[PDB]
């Protein structure tokens, strides 16, 4: 059933929420690397559409 | 040739077509410099790409 599936999205969202509490600095070095990553790739985009404009 | 610089002579050459001709006429356009520019330029965009793809490879 879906209704385990979304309870199990959020209460499991709770449930990664604890488990990053387990490893909040793991969980920073982890995000962090995502998002320098991602903040890069909207950047190097961003900008060199701009300069093509 | 020496490597030399064409910003430099250039203006030798002008006081010394100002005098070889009585007149300044040879209105030359200038070498070289053109070329030192966009090699400046072009390792500049060297310098963008290898440097921020580095940088992501450190991030990595």
Same mark, same amino acid.
């Given at each position: 059933?879906?209704?385990?599936?979304?309870?199990?999205?959020?209460?499991? *969202? /709770? #449930?990664?929420?604890?488990?990053?509490?387990?490893?909040?600095?793991?969980?920073? *070095? /982890? #995000?962090?690397?995502?998002?320098?990553?991602?903040?890069?790739?909207?950047?190097?985009?961003?900008?060199?559409?701009?300069?093509?404009? | 040739?020496?490597?030399?610089?064409?910003?430099?002579?250039?203006?030798?050459?002008?006081?010394?077509?100002?005098?070889?001709?009585?007149?300044?006429?040879?209105?030359?356009?200038?070498?070289?410099?053109?070329?030192?520019?966009?090699?400046?330029?072009?390792?500049?965009?060297?310098?963008?790409?290898?440097?921020?793809?580095?940088?992501?490879?450190?991030?990595?």
């Amino acid at each position: 059933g879906w209704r385990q599936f979304v309870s199990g999205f959020n209460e499991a *969202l /709770t #449930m990664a929420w604890r488990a990053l509490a387990a490893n909040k600095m793991r969980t920073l *070095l /982890t #995000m962090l690397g995502i998002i320098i990553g991602i903040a890069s790739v909207v950047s190097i985009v961003v900008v060199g559409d701009a300069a093509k404009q | 040739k020496e490597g030399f610089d064409s910003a430099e002579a250039e203006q030798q050459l002008t006081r010394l077509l100002s005098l070889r001709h009585g007149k300044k006429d040879f209105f030359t356009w200038n070498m070289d410099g053109v070329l030192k520019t966009v090699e400046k330029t072009t390792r500049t965009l060297q310098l963008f790409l290898t440097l921020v793809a580095v940088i992501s490879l450190v991030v990595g």
